[PDB]
Amino acid sequence: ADPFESYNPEFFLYDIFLKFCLKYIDGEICHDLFLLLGKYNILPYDTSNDSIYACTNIKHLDFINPFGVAAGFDKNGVCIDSILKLGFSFIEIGTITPRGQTGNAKPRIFRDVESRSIINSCGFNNMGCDKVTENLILFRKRQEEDKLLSKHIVGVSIGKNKDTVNIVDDLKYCINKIGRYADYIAINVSSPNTPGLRDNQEAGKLKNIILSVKEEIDNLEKNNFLWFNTTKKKPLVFVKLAPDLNQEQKKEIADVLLETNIDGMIISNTTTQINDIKSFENKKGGVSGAKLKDISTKFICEMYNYTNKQIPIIASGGIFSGLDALEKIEAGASVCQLYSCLVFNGMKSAVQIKRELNHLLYQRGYYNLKEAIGRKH
Ligand SMILES: Cc1cc2nc3c(=O)[nH]c(=O)nc-3n(C[C@H](O)[C@H](O)[C@H](O)COP(=O)(O)O)c2cc1C
Numbered sequence: 001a002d003p004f005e006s007y008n009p010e011f012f013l014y015d016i017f018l019k020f021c022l023k024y025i026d027g028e029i030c031h032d033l034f035l036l037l038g039k040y041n042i043l044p045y046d047t048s049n050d051s052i053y054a055c056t057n058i059k060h061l062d063f064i065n066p067f068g069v070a071a072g073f074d075k076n077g078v079c080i081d082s083i084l085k086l087g088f089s090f091i092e093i094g095t096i097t098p099r100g101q102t103g104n105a106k107p108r109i110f111r112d113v114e115s116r117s118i119i120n121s122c123g124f125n126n127m128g129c130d131k132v133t134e135n136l137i138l139f140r141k142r143q144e145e146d147k148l149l150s151k152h153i154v155g156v157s158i159g160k161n162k163d164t165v166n167i168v169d170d171l172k173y174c175i176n177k178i179g180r181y182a183d184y185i186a187i188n189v190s191s192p193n194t195p196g197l198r199d200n201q202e203a204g205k206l207k208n209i210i211l212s213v214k215e216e217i218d219n220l221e222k223n224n225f226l227w228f229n230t231t232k233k234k235p236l237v238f239v240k241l242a243p244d245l246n247q248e249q250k251k252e253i254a255d256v257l258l259e260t261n262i263d264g265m266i267i268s269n270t271t272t273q274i275n276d277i278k279s280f281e282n283k284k285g286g287v288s289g290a291k292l293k294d295i296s297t298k299f300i301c302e303m304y305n306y307t308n309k310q311i312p313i314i315a316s317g318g319i320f321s322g323l324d325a326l327e328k329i330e331a332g333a334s335v336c337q338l339y340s341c342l343v344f345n346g347m348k349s350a351v352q353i354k355r356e357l358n359h360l361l362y363q364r365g366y367y368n369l370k371e372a373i374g375r376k377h
């Protein structure tokens, strides 16, 4: 669309505000401002039909296009509608925990524009499962009455409170509160900002976690119209994995994912292993964005092979352009999540990246996105 003729996601004024934000305004404040505008439904909408040749699925989850918003973006589910309506097919709200908590002291989010990278040490700041459940329930009620929202997907990422000893207690609480409203549940065993959380990727611990989560979801129908979500079915179960793993760890994790019949794997969370960004040198936390891209694409290729292509992959890490997305898809991903792209490219990100991917699928000779999945191998 013309950035000057019309209020649409490409509207020029948002690019002027984005440039000002990136130069002058603290990152978490910029993010809060975006969420404030979305909560009040000020943000433009993408009303276009997405190309039928770029749809994708994971089992019965039918994504209308291949781009969603990653976890940590709308932690509290406060502007689900406005984010989706920028042109995304899905959003992963959370990560939530049973009780609300503040997270780590601010400033805890920093950007490096030159390298299109972000570092954060948020520490699972969220309003808590009960309030976020109330938010998701209100979304689901608006969704029943909205032409624009009817087929969009909402997953919920779940984690543990800061002082919880046994993570499964917290995952079960969340499932029993919010699981009926989710299209999928993402198990967060990969935040670098909760000390010890990533230890739960060890095969034995991870297996028990996955089996516990599936058992709790399976019990929702026994204990209890039921599925007040998009699929009208019980939520699928995904695990989100850390990129900072050796090959032995990756291989034992793959074996567990196969053994437990997990529905998908989100590859990947942030990394702790990037140290050539000078403005991050004194900073804690996990790195996102363009310096994560190659690490996470390689990890996709590895896990796709190690699971013999039997476990669908949601790609996360350093996706900015249509080419970046195609690279993820050809590596093995069925669908992409964005986060840093929205920080550095703003309101127009979904409209721009869908168009760029549609042009590449054509230029490369693919009939549709599904035939690209895994084609590198
Ligand atoms: C400020 C911030 C907070 C995040 N919070 C979470 C979170 O709560 N849960 C989660 O699974 N990932 C979280 N992430 C990770 C992103 O979901 C994503 O996996 C990562 O940023 C890599 O994608 P990107 O390179 O497109 O940004 C967070 C990322 C950022 C930058």
Ligand SMILES: CCOC(=O)c1[nH]c(C)c(Cc2ccc(C(F)(F)F)cc2)c1C
Pocket (backbone or CB within 6 Å): 014, 017, 018, 021, 022, 026, 027, 028, 030, 031, 033, 034, 037, 109, 110, 111, 118, 342, 343, 344, 346, 347
């Ligand atoms: C990593 C910390 O998050 C950020 O640094 C951040 N997060 C988002 C979603 C953005 C993009 C953005 C575009 C327009 C506006 C305005 F409201 F001004 F229009 C506000 C924000 C930025 C810069």
Ligand SMILES: O=C(O)c1cc(=O)[nH]c(=O)[nH]1
Pocket (backbone or CB within 6 Å): 072, 095, 120, 121, 122, 123, 124, 125, 188, 190, 191, 192, 193, 269, 270, 286
């Ligand atoms: O809460 C955060 O600090 C956070 C969670 C997560 O999973 N990943 C991340 O980079 N930050």
